[PDB]
Amino acid sequence: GSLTINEERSEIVDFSVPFVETGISVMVARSNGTVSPSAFLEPYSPAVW
Amino acid sequence: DSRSNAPATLTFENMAGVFMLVAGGIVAGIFLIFIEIAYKRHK
């Protein structure tokens, strides 16, 4: 199976040659497009209101 | 925190430029409606 070869374990057990090319990466939640108006009174500072 | 929310808020400057328009309405008409009233009324 998916057994990542390493030096910390090659000591207590041997290992053959690899059959893949894997890296480590970060996975994050979905990409979403949403706007951010808190309140409709936003376009005017309360100084003018 | 880091935000930089909203690339504006309409200044209290341009509205003054809008406020100046109505101000001229408040100042002008009365002087006419009062002073000229003496003329068209009597004769």
DSSP codes joined into one string, B1-37: -----SS----TTHHHHHHHHHHHHHHHHHHHHHHTH
Q: How far is CA B18 from the centre of its chain?
A: 6
Q: List the structure tokens of A31.
A: 């990409």
Q: List the structure tokens of A11.
A: 């000591």
CB of B9 within 8 Å of a chain A CB? The answer is yes
Nearest chain B CA: its distance from A24 CA (Å): 30
**Contact between A45 and B10 using a beta-carbon 8 Å cutoff:** yes
CB of A49 within 8 Å of a chain B CB? The answer is no
Distance CA A1, CA A5 (A): 12
